Design a protein around this ligand. Structure first.
Ligand SMILES: [Mg+2]
Ligand SMILES: [Mg+2]
Ligand SMILES: [Mg+2]
Ligand SMILES: [Zn+2]
Lengths: 55, 122, 49, 124, 100, 69
RNA sequence: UUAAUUGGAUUCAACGCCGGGAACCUCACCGGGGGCGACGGCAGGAUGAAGGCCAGGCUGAAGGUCUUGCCGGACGCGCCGAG
């Protein structure tokens, strides 16, 4: 076929297996407790999720 | 098939029943143009209304339908012209075999013309 | 062009030179490899004659 | 002054199962063989066996740098990709147990020039 | 014959309101209740670099989410069990009921 | 024990040997020479006097004289 | 230096910094091989457009393409705008 020359392989580990669910970036993904967010995206949506800066 | 093949005459009634009763059939049925597509269907009996215009030359790929007419019931009629047959059912090109299955509200005329062709020449 | 020939069909008799695949019905035709029945879509390692 | 690998001549190595040979190689080769060969290595091995049988009178070119040299490959010449071109390698008996990539360098040797501006503190 | 009730929330007031409702239900009948036991709080702490780029001094944020818990044990009585099954929690409180 | 000798599974005989003095020196020399004959990567590294076990060389391993600009 | 050794930052306030511990991916660099044009219009097209394949060459490997002929029925990048 022809569309086979456009599909990516289904990776199970490595940096290529995880993307931010809000912007699609590869790299600095926060994996704690199942979050999948960049360090950039988490900073601006943290107050809505209920986190606070106590100290 | 082709005009240079004298099978029988050209009654007006057969053309009336064959060209003017597929526009009422297209809107409530499925269309299968083309000789090669229809050939397998008519060999397998999938063809129901085999309308054959005399526009295809040479006597190479037209020389299959008549010798296969005895192999099946093959209710078939002949079409005078190719220009508007596609306009009757399909697309605006020249078609030679518009075979359709289960047309809607075209039973009495089709049965009568099929009987007439059966008793006319086979 | 046009591809419908090589079939022995006479004025009244229709018989196919190339058999159809046993998987499917009549009408689908094989190739003419001559060493094996190519079949196009099924393929057979039979050493046809 | 013949060749021996663990007390075996070349011919005794030739008539060995891949499992029996795997007990003589170092641990890395043994684990690689036990875990099976990749499909690309399968195609390369098929070509090699064909060439040995007397067919395939064409040069062998391959992208497989991680293929392990085997005794039945001795005497052939293989062209291994180094990144930009295929280099010839002539397989000798003392190569048994090595990866092909070890014989096709991927970097050029460095011959230094004169240090330029900013190479020292005083040049900035 | 005794049922165990677990509660959890990010808001400390709603937890106490639901617990007080349960305590009133139990007192409103003749039934023994093992008092609301406070279990250790869950803290989720996440530390991140602030700047989008890599230039400048490195400074950090320390975000925190706190989850509070309670535990109540009470003997299963049909007259009182239906009442504690009819009480509906605010949307930010999780409640689970099991039979031991 | 066999796992205590300094040349187990000899490359030529296949046995477990322990070498001392000159024999040890010439065995090591022969191993390096074999690596050099087949033009293997480690043989080239041995010839050029550069690190063999995959070290970085931009910063450390400097033995020479400062060049002028 | 190299085929390439991808880029940003240069006093404090650049240099275990870009959460930068890169085997593949990441990837932006180098050598090579493939794929893609909603919507309008031109050629063309059921006398079958576009599209898909058993075997075998080409190839690092590939119906990618060629050889060998079989499958599918309605749109059309061979041309112009536009995306
Ligand atoms: Mg740089
Ligand atoms: Mg690493
Ligand atoms: Mg990489
Ligand atoms: Zn993000």
């Amino acid at each position: 076929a022809k569309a086979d020359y456009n599909k990516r392989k289904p990776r199970k580990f490595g940096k290529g297996a995880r993307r931010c669910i809000r912007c699609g970036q590869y790299g600095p993904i926060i994996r704690i407790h199942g979050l999948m967010l960049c360090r950039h995206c988490f900073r601006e949506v943290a107050p809505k999720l209920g986190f606070r800066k106590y100290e | 098939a082709k005009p240079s093949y004298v099978k029988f005459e050209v009654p007006k009634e057969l053309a009336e029943k064959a060209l003017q009763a597929v526009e009422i059939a297209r809107d409530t049925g499925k269309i299968r143009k083309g000789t090669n597509e229809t050939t397998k269907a008519v060999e397998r009996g999938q063809a129901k209304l085999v309308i054959i215009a005399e526009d295809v030359d040479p006597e190479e790929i037209v020389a299959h339908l008549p010798p296969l007419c005895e192999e099946k019931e093959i209710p078939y009629i002949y079409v005078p012209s190719k220009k508007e047959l596609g306009a009757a059912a399909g697309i605006e090109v020249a078609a030679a075999s518009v075979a359709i299955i289960e047309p809607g509200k075209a039973r009495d005329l089709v049965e009568e013309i099929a009987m007439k062709v059966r008793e006319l020449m086979k | 062009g046009q591809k419908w020939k090589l079939y022995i069909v006479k004025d009244g008799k229709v018989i196919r030179k190339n058999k159809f695949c046993p998987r499917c019905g009549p009408g689908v035709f094989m190739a003419d490899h001559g060493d094996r029945w190519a079949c196009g879509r099924c393929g057979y390692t039979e050493w046809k004659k | 002054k013949e060749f021996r690998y663990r007390g075996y001549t070349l011919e005794q190595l030739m008539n060995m199962s891949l499992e029996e040979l795997a007990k003589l190689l170092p641990a890395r080769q043994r684990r690689s063989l036990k875990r099976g060969l990749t499909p690309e290595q399968k195609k390369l091995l098929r070509k090699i066996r064909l060439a040995k049988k007397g067919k395939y009178n064409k040069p062998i070119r391959t992208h497989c740098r991680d293929m392990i040299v085997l005794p039945e490959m001795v005497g052939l010449t293989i062209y291994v990709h180094n990144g930009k071109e295929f280099v010839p390698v002539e397989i000798k008996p003392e190569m048994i147990g090595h990866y092909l990539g070890e014989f096709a360098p991927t970097r050029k040797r460095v011959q230094h020039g004169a240090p330029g501006i900013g190479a020292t503190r005083s040049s900035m | 014959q005794k049922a165990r009730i677990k509660l959890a929330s990010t808001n400390v007031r709603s937890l106490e309101e639901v617990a007080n409702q349960i305590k009133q239900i139990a007192e409103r009948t003749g039934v023994r209740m093992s008092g609301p036991i406070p279990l250790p709080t869950k803290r989720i702490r996440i530390v991140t670099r602030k700047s989008p780029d890599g230039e400048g001094s490195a400074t950090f944020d320390r975000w925190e989410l706190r989850i509070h818990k309670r535990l109540i044990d009470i003997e299963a009585d049909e007259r009182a069990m239906r009442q504690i099954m009819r009480i509906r929690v605010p949307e930010d409180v999780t409640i689970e009921i099991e039979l031991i | 024990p066999r796992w205590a000798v300094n040349r187990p599974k000899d490359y030529e005989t296949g046995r477990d040997l322990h070498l001392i003095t000159a024999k040890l020196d010439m065995a090591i020399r022969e191993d390096i020479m074999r690596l050099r004959r087949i033009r293997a990567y480690r043989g080239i590294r041995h010839e050029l006097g550069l690190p063999v076990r995959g070290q970085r060389t931009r910063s450390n391993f400097r033995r020479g004289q400062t060049v002028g600009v």
